C-alpha cells in the first residue's frame, strides 16, 4: 500500500493573488506562506491567471511535490517585460529592478 506522510491549517494564496494593490518591481515585499497546507490544483482549476508558467515545477505535479516554505513576489510589469525575465535569458527587468536565479 502507499503511506504518504504529511505533518494542516490553510495557506493564504487568495490574499496574495487578489491584493487590491501590488508592490513595484524594483521594491517588493516578500510574504512567507508557512504552517499551512497548500493546494495548487484549485489555483490551476480556477485558471484566474491568463497563463500558467512553471520553469521549475510541473503544475500538475505541484500537489505531489512538497515545499516546506512558499514565498510569493508581487509586482506589476508589462506583458513584454514578463517575457524578458526567464532562466538562461537576459532581460531589461533582470538587468535592474529584479533578478531571477
Amino acid at each position: 500500500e502507499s503511506i504518504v506522510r504529511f505533518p494542516t491549517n490553510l495557506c493564504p494564496f487568495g490574499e496574495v493573488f487578489n491584493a487590491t494593490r501590488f508592490a513595484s518591481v524594483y521594491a517588493w515585499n516578500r510574504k512567507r506562506i508557512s504552517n499551512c497546507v497548500a493546494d495548487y490544483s484549485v489555483l490551476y482549476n480556477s485558471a484566474s491567471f491568463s497563463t500558467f508558467k512553471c520553469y521549475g515545477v510541473s503544475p500538475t505535479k505541484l500537489n505531489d511535490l512538497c515545499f516546506t516554505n512558499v514565498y510569493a513576489d508581487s509586482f506589476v510589469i508589462r506583458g513584454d517585460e514578463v517575457r524578458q525575465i526567464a532562466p538562461g535569458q537576459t532581460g531589461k527587468i533582470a538587468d535592474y529592478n529584479y533578478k531571477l536565479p
Binding site: 521549475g56 515545477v57 510541473s58 500538475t60 505535479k61 505531489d64 511535490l65
Partner: protein, 103 residues
Amino acid sequence: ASALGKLQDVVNQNAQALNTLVKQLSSNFGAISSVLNDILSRLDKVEAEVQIDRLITGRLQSLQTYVTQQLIRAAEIRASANLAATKMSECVLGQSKRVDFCG
C-alpha cells in the same frame, strides 16, 4: 598487519570502486538533480526526458567504467590465480627445481 597487504589491497579496491560506484548515484551529471524522481516530480516529462538522459548517460557510462575496471582487475587476479595453481601444483605437490620460484 602489513604482511597481508596483497590480500588487503584486493579487498579494499573492490570495496573501493563499489563506494565510488554508489557515490556516482548522487552526482548531477548535468541533470537538475540526482534523485531520479525529483526530475519527474519537478518537470513535465517531455523536458524531463532530456534530463534523465544526462543521468542515464552519466550512470550508464559510470557502470562501464566500473565493469571495465573489474574485468581488468580480475584479469590480474586471473594471472595471480595461475601463479598460485602453479605453485600449489609444483611447489606444494611436488618439489620445485625453479630457483626462487618458491621463495
